[PDB]
């Protein structure tokens, strides 16, 4: 099957591009780069970890914004190619108030706004930071969601050429690809 989207009823009339652009600016840049990752405040975490998991989650240091990347993910840490997030990315959940972690059986968002599933991304280790999984996730860490937008757009086009990141969430629901959250 194809991409599947969950959205809060608040974003019915928003386009995906507009929402992601606003979400990016809200989450901001955690400043996760060489020389600026000195403690656990801007690293995020893996479930189960320490370097691999079915989830990678990160909260904003600017706000209550958080995301959860779901799939089969791996971080190289110091091994070559250095500082590469790779593997399978099935889903990205975006919202507020990250809860849980490895010690309590998984991460969750207290207030999920939007999630994208069946992304079908799969980047090998040998691509390093040129990998699509890497760029998508690092984009979300550093306040630029355009890599994610690009992948969502391709997945939507594949379902129908009239669907895009510029479609509204309601339009995407009308197309059978999205669904509004039962409790907003």
Give the whole-angstrom CA distance, residue 165 versus residue 102: 33
The residue ranges of every structural domain in the chain are 1-184
* Concatenated DSSP letters of 77-137: TTSSSSS-EEEEEEEEEEEEEEEEEGGGTEEEEEEEEEEEE---EEE-GGGGGGSHHHHHH
Bridge-partner residues for 88, per DSSP?
Answer: 72, 122
CA distance 135 to 120: 15
- With CA atoms as reference, report the closest residue to 145 among 16, 52, 44: 16
Q: Which tokens belong to 130?
A: 């040129």
Is the bond into 81 cis (omega within 30 degrees of 0)?
A: yes
Please state the residue numbers annotated as binding site: 32, 35, 75, 83, 129, 138
- The Cα 173–Cα 11 span in angstroms is 12
Q: Which parts are annotated binding residues for heme b?
A: 32, 35, 75, 83, 129, 138
Annotated binding site for heme: 32, 75
Query: CA 3, CA 96: separation in Å to the nearest integer?
Result: 22
How far are the Cα atoms of 10, 14, 42 from residue 31, in angstroms, in the given order?
Answer: 30, 28, 7
Q: Is 150 strand, coil or helix?
A: helix
Q: CA-CA distance, 33 to 13, in Å (whole number)? A: 36
Q: Does domain 1-184 have CATH number 3.30.1500.10?
A: yes
Contacts of range 48-57, beta carbons closer than 8 Å, 24 or more positions apart: 48/102, 49/102, 51/75, 51/76, 51/77, 52/87, 53/102, 55/106, 55/107, 56/85, 56/137, 57/98, 57/101, 57/107
């Amino acid at each position: 099957m194809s991409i599947s989207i969950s959205y809060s009823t608040t974003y019915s009339g928003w386009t995906v591009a507009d929402y992601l652009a606003d979400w990016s600016a809200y989450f901001g840049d955690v400043n996760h780069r060489p020389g600026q990752v000195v403690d656990g405040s801007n690293t995020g975490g893996f479930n189960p970890g320490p370097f691999d998991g079915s989830q990678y989650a990160l909260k904003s240091t600017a706000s209550d914004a958080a995301f959860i990347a779901g799939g089969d993910l791996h971080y190289t840490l110091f091994s070559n190619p250095s500082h590469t997030l790779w593997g399978k990315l099935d889903s990205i959940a975006l919202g507020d108030t990250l809860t849980g972690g490895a010690s309590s059986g998984g991460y969750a968002l207290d207030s999920q706004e939007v999630s994208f599933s069946n992304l079908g991304l799969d980047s090998p280790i040998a691509q390093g930071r040129d990998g699509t999984v890497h760029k998508v996730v690092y984009g979300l860490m550093s306040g630029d969601s355009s890599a994610l937008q690009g992948q969502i757009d391709a997945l939507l086009k594949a379902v129908d050429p009239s669907l895009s990141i510029n479609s509204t969430f309601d339009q995407l629901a009308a197309a059978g690809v999205a669904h509004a959250t039962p409790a907003a």
